[PDB]
């Protein structure tokens, strides 16, 4: 054990777990999931007295881990067991493909108006308990290269056309679960090469949500240190979940 020294003491014996997940999505214009995965890692900040034997239980088998490396200190068998380094370390990393919660449903609607205008409506639906708030929601609607200007209306958030980037960027500070927001935009088209079909790229999203999209949920983290005279009941334990978009594209 060259990852933890031997004489370690704390009045307040406390640990913190961060479940950090990136959820990736490619949805067809109809609503098929073409492809979707989650990449996750658990980080553990530990301030525990001695050299303790901890047992990390999640809800495996309940969700389905495709595969997952671990950290040195993990003894493989069959639940997860270790003597943690002190302070902060990555306990595990993992991937998931099955039974993924997709926190956001993006519903695009596009209408051509002769050769002068594109009419676009986009609806976002949040798909999770009303009690929880997504934050840092960024919707990105791409615009053709022949774009003279853009009008947008939206009741929630602020949106501005970014011509440098050829996209409308709609930002919402926070949104509750089980809700709907929409944006309307009118895109004014310069005339163009006549035989140029717009390769309509995907509408894409950014968000942070306070839960694991994988479905992963921490059930216990048990601390046993048999020398010293603090039991498990004495340890103060915290989780937080931070699920963030990776690639989260919906085809229009």
């Amino acid at each position: 054990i060259g990852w933890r020294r031997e004489g370690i003491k704390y009045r307040r014996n406390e640990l913190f777990l961060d479940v950090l997940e990136s959820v990736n999505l490619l949805m067809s214009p109809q609503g098929q999931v073409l492809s979707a995965h989650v990449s996750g890692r658990v980080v553990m900040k530990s301030y525990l007295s001695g050299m303790p034997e901890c047992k990390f239980g999640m809800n495996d088998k309940s969700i389905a881990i495709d595969d997952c490396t671990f950290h040195q200190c993990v003894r493989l068998s069959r639940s997860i067991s270790f003597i943690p380094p002190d302070g902060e370390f990555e306990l595990m990393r993992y991937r998931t493909t099955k039974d993924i919660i997709l926190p956001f449903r993006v519903i695009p609607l596009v209408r051509e108006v002769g050769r002068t205008k594109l009419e676009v409506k986009v609806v976002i639906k949040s798909n999770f308990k009303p009690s929880l708030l997504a934050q840092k929601i960024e919707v990105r609607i791409p615009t053709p290269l022949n774009t003279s200007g853009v009008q947008v209306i939206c009741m929630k958030g602020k949106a501005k056309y970014k011509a440098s980037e050829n996209a409308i960027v709609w930002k919402i500070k926070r949104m509750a679960g089980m809700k709907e927001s929409q944006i309307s935009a009118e895109i004014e088209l310069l005339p163009t090469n006549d035989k140029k079909k717009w390769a309509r790229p995907p509408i894409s999203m950014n968000f942070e949500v306070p839960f694991a999209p994988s479905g992963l949920k921490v059930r216990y983290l048990k601390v046993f240190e048999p020398k010293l005279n603090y039991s498990d009941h004495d340890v103060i334990k915290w989780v937080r979940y931070i699920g963030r978009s990776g690639i989260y594209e919906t085809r229009c």
């Binding site: 913190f16 306070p210 921490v218 059930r219 216990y220 983290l221 334990k237 915290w238 989780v239 937080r240």
Partner: peptide, 8 residues
Amino acid sequence: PYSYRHFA
């Protein structure tokens, strides 16, 4: 405004 909750 939150960050960090007890399990269950």
